[PDB]
Design a protein around this ligand. Structure first.
Ligand SMILES: [Mn+2]
Ligand SMILES: [Mn+2]
Ligand SMILES: [Zn+2]
Ligand SMILES: [Zn+2]
Lengths: 364, 370
């Protein structure tokens, strides 16, 4: 009662062909559609173990015949990064062959569909959703990527663009559970943030060079703006969950995160004959990404933190110092009030290294 | 206060010349000699901060004119590794240019001196120590390394081989404070182990491919065996201190470790007009390296630990599992009673990855030849 696909990438520079294993729990192309992936950055582990245990919960839901939609699970979304060992360490953030970030350069499904949708939209929002989703699938079918990493990105967006719910599971080098989403999907995804116990929710309409979560949700916002004459709702509700620290692999945590993801699926109509009960209290407000402070090391040296992970800090507070063991010490200050939701796992800096993050409000 | 030397390495593949900063607090070639280095593995930080604070303590001792010997301090013994960033991470264990481990392929000063010492030894132990140390310095003078990493290794052993006390400050990926020394320097270095609060003391006569600590202490043991007709004491007392986890950078800890290193220097006659007092409780017995179990991942996957760092584990206990999130789970057991003094910081495995260490007392059948 669970489908398993092993999608084969083309051979890399060493002639090695890698596979993306994809699990599907429901009725193909039916009902509501959910997409959950982990390990796009192959060195970010908590999502991998969480989806292993979410599978155990969905295996039971399938046996009890309780799966209402199509639920797509990819515990290891990036088998290219997962092979990239150097000197005994897994470096899973950048592609060795291209040097590019695994969570950048996704297709713009607005740019690829605006031409095709010219005469296809009506006053019926539900019609527009089905037309836009079919157009997106067609547009992607016409693309012929060659590099393993481009083929990987292509498959992942092909299997997620038409979903109602998309959770990209990530981690930071040393961080509290936090969430990113498209600004206008707040407060729509309050329930998701609450269930996973996010300690920061960071909002943007456009962030970097076309990341995966924005590749899924942004097109609905940009098409709405392209065709203001028609009802185009934000049909694909995507978010990035930073579930914790890159190396935070704990049995209890992964089980708790799997249970939270299961509760999210129940709340959004993927699981039948299960009572959830009261939504947990959200521990933070949604804030703009533009209001977040990156703490940067102005020089090389030891990273000495004066604040614990998750401390509420005030503008002017000494948060972290760079200590040259054969030289000088430099103090680095908070420039905004907020929560120090991220630091770093490797306590040595190079100049301009991001060594921490504070979720602020941008007051005036 | 102190002498400061900036020893220049030859230019690397990008034409960049790196320097090793060396501090000296005493006279020269004087009294007892101490050598302390940190960051030979450039991604191992606790020793770097500890020696910065040990310098603060020695600056004050120098101002008060209380340094009795020569004390040599190198907080960052490896400026080659310290530059080796890849994808925003510091890879400080292996040399990019040679592929070699920074703490391997040191000179065998027994092999380099046995020929020269043929007719130089007498019934006077103290004479033999001075003869062997002078011979070691000469033997090293004759060597002409060309590659930056070989020149670096050469300088570090040249400035440490003739020391009475050598502490090579290291860290492990995720570990409790623990110590390695030459088997016959146990119990001699019980005081050192006690002051640094080692939770494991691991003994070997020869470990891997010629590491630094053994390069300093082994020659005395091997020369004693080469010339059994003469008194050759273990003149150079070396140990490796794994001070904690690679990224364990804490003000309190570095200050506590600096204070402990200072107390070791006082106990061994390097600091005047300071009394130390009662030796702290030793937390563990000295055990053989061959009695230590390396836990190895038999396959790739998530590393899921069932035991906390520092837990006492029994033979047969499930300590760690390798979990393929799209496959099977494999359980890994303790095969000896002992303390799980090390695990690992990066909780994903490749086959044969060492993912933990248990300090046992019974020698294990598989642990021969390291
Ligand atoms: Mn400081
Ligand atoms: Mn398990
Ligand atoms: Zn990420
Ligand atoms: Zn080391």
């Amino acid at each position: 009662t669970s489908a398993c696909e092993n999608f084969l990438l083309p051979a890399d520079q060493d002639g090695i062909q890698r596979q993306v294993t994809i699990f599907r729990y429901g009725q193909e192309n039916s009902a509501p559609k959910a997409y959950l992936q982990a390990g796009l950055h192959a060195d970010e582990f908590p999502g991998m173990l969480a989806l292993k245990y979410l599978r155990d919960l969905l295996d039971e839901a399938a046996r009890r015949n309780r799966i209402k939609g199509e639920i797509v699970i990819i515990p290891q979304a990036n088998p290219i990064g997962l092979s990239q060992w150097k000197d005994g360490f897994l470096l899973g953030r950048f592609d060795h062959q291209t040097g590019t970030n695994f969570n950048r350069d996704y297709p713009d499904l607005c740019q690829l569909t605006v031409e095709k949708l010219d005469g296809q939209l009506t006053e019926n929002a539900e019609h527009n959703i089905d037309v836009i989703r079919k157009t997106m699938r067609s547009a992607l079918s016409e693309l012929k990527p060659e590099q393993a990493v481009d083929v990987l990105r292509h498959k992942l967006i092909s299997e997620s663009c038409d979903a109602d719910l998309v959770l990209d599971l990530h981690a930071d080098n040393q961080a509290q559970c936090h969430m990113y989403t498209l600004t206008p999907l707040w407060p729509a995804m309050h329930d998701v943030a609450a269930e996973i116990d996010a300690r920061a929710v960071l909002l943007a309409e456009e962030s970097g060079g076309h990341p995966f979560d924005e590749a899924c949700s942004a097109p609905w916002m940009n098409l709405s703006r392209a065709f203001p004459d028609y009802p185009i709702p934000l049909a694909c509700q995507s978010a990035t969950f930073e579930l914790g620290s890159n190396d935070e692999v704990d049995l209890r945590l992964a089980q708790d995160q799997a249970e939270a993801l299961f509760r999210i699926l129940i709340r959004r109509g993927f699981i039948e004959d299960v009572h959830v009960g009261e939504l947990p209290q959200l521990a933070c407000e949604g804030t703009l990404l533009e209001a977040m402070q990156q703490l940067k090391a102005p020089c090389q040296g030891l990273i000495v933190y004066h604040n614990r992970l998750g401390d509420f800090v005030r503008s002017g507070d000494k948060v972290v110092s760079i200590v040259d063991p054969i030289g000088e010490t430099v103090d680095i200050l908070a420039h905004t009030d907020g929560v120090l939701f991220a630091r770093h796992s490797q306590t040595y800096a190079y100049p301009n290294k991001v060594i921490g993050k504070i979720a602020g409000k941008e007051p005036l």
